[PDB]
Amino acid sequence: RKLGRTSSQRKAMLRDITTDLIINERIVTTEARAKEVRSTVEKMITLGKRGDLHARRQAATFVRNEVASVREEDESIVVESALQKLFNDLGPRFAERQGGYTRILKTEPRRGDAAPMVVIEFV
Template structure:
């Protein structure tokens, strides 16, 4: 029997190991997370991520490759493949890799085997980046239509302010003009009285 590329085999032979890993991948795509041993989880990760990469391509050849890996003889597996291509792959379209996460959960009670949970990483790349992208998109949408009205709205406000300032200054100027002749009249009045006294 030829030696495997990485580590010991999980089953009796290479065909058994391949079938076991493909069945684990199908279970992972169906349930989004499964509990298995750490060794199986580590061997499952590259198999599952390769199938997700094919699903992200989305063409007919990729679908047939995934069907060859996950035996599509039953309706259950056909449904899993459909779910992989229509639901899981679009959720992971922004992610460049690292579609799975392995979390160790301690040892199994019976044989003390180290156990782990392997799950699909379906959340956004990072919450902060998602919020920043949404904020940038909202700012662009808000800035584009409002850019023109803001300029137009400022111009009338300044004109209104100037006219209000002119209106405020105008009564003061009128009041000053009306006060000035009154003062002149009062000054002329004594002179006229003085001329009248001289004439008498």
């Protein structure tokens, strides 16, 4: 593994990054956080493939509690809390694809620190 800070700070940083990239399917950050987050995200999508209680109540600790995602209305305001998304949209979208569902792209360093940045996608 790769530490960046103390323990609990790293845990919170990952529980942050993998909650985006659930909502946007794309993210532009550095190189190391990329590798650790691809591991974590792929490990938190197999839980989207069981869909029962126990997988629900185990996934429900590695996701920022409530982060709305609303692009829908029929005559209503439907709200999707970025976990319900995990169990409603990403899940049924990977049934036949087995492990390994993220792409990492090495783009270009940054202005102030020359930290070689990177992208992350899903298909």
